[PDB]
Amino acid sequence: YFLPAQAGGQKCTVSINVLLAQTVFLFLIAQKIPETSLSVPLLGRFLIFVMVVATLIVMNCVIVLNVSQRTPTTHAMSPRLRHVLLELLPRL
Amino acid sequence: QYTGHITWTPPAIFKSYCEIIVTHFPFDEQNCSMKLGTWTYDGSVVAINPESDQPDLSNFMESGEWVIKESRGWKHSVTYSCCPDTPYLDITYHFVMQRLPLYFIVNVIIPCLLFSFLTGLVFYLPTDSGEKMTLSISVLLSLTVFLLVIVELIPSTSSAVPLIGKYMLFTMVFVIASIIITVIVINTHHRVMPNWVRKVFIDTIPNIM
Amino acid sequence: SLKYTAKEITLSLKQDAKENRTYPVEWIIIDPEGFTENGEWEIVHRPARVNVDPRAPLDSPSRQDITFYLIIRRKPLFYIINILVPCVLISFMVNLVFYLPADSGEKTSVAISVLLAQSVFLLLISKRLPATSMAIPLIGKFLLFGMVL
Ligand SMILES: *[C@@H]1O[C@H](CO)[C@@H](O[C@@H]2O[C@H](CO)[C@@H](O[C@@H]3O[C@H](CO[C@H]4O[C@H](CO[C@H]5O[C@H](CO)[C@@H](O)[C@H](O)[C@@H]5O)[C@@H](O)[C@H](O[C@H]5O[C@H](CO)[C@@H](O)[C@H](O)[C@@H]5O)[C@@H]4O)[C@@H](O)[C@H](O[C@H]4O[C@H](CO)[C@@H](O)[C@H](O)[C@@H]4O)[C@@H]3O)[C@H](O)[C@H]2NC(C)=O)[C@H](O)[C@H]1NC(C)=O
């Protein structure tokens, strides 16, 4: 999120690479833990949760880059979202 | 016993062959069997009979990966080409084992769905980000790695294709096509405009929406 | 036999009879009640030969043997679906590098990612095949050619 919302901002690249790293950690856990399906390890559940969160971070970065790179020549600015992000969210 | 009745209960670890059906993996039911019979004594010489219609599962240590949904024993008499005048008896015990999918759901299916979801985000991601191509290529690579994972978990028998594997190949083709069209879009964005392109994308498409 | 030789034991193929005429069983017997079809390998030929080496001494163990042969063909559809098609599709992706604009700044990324994927596929196949130096495997030749390109 702190990475710039403008060209050169590796937001999606960073998010997907960290997701891949967590997937590698998931592979490591899957090797050390039996294929038994009676329960899911809490460490594995944490890994899955972090992967889901990372995919949501990717989605949010895509949305942010979409909004930032919008132009008045191609998109009509929504008054609700504009007013929210301008005043209502910072002053919330 | 004094009546001459002999009871013998030897332990064994049978490593029997089973045709693993890959289609519904990892939600597959496997039907694995054990064909047991007297090798040299034929049915007119030693007759074997099943103790019960079903295997004795009363001492079965519950497996953490497979659930035995059904078990049954069938006695058969068959004639082999070795021995055409003497049919040989066997009892084929079989077990219908259903896989518990939770481990494979966690470690394969959920990541595959997560990376699949990331495919479509490329079309909302602007060209000016420069992240379109890296995103789609990383999705393609991750999907390829997970296909390589699946191909290791599944026998190379070619009798039938798996359905998760078929879905993975379909998703691979879809991602390849998405990357192709993304390259087309990127080249278009950096580009005299023909009348049909303007009529379709600038006039017709927004008018229909 | 190793305990006996052609001087002590004569190996021969099983003879069988039809219409009161005998013939040697010069093939591996497959019994439809006893035989389980392999899911990868189709048995194309299954000959049997009694082999006699005329130069071997009559009292040598190597003079006679019976060899049963299995000429089995791989059922390739599994490998076509799971390996060949993904590898070819990812390989042909490199052709998009030329069409991608130079202003995009992602052409090297695409090309190197295709190279990495091809390297991973070559790693996979080299695990599935022996390190025989007799010939390069067909898919291995394809992978090397693709990586060079
Ligand atoms: C999982 O996989 C396993 C295998 O891997 C599979 O197991 C099969 O299960 C089915 C049922 O689901 C079994 O089918 C039943 O087989 C019964 C046994 O049949 C044999 O014995 C019969 C006995 O009759 C006489 O046999 C001799 C004379 O030959 C004599 O000495 C005896 O005293 C006795 O009088 C015999 O008739 C039968 O012959 C069959 O096969 C021959 C040739 O193969 C054919 O010519 C015959 O027509 C006949 O098909 C065989 O030798 C059998 O009793 C039983 O019959 C019931 O059902 C049928 C209809 O299904 C009714 O018509 C009948 O009245 C009975 O109600 C039935 O046929 C099969 O044998 C199993 N096979 C193996 C290899 O184990 C599981 O099903 C799979 N499960 C899944 C996928 O969920």
Ligand SMILES: CC(=O)OCC[N+](C)(C)C
């Ligand atoms: C006679 C003899 O040993 O037969 C063994 C083969 N079998 C059990 C398939 C008929």
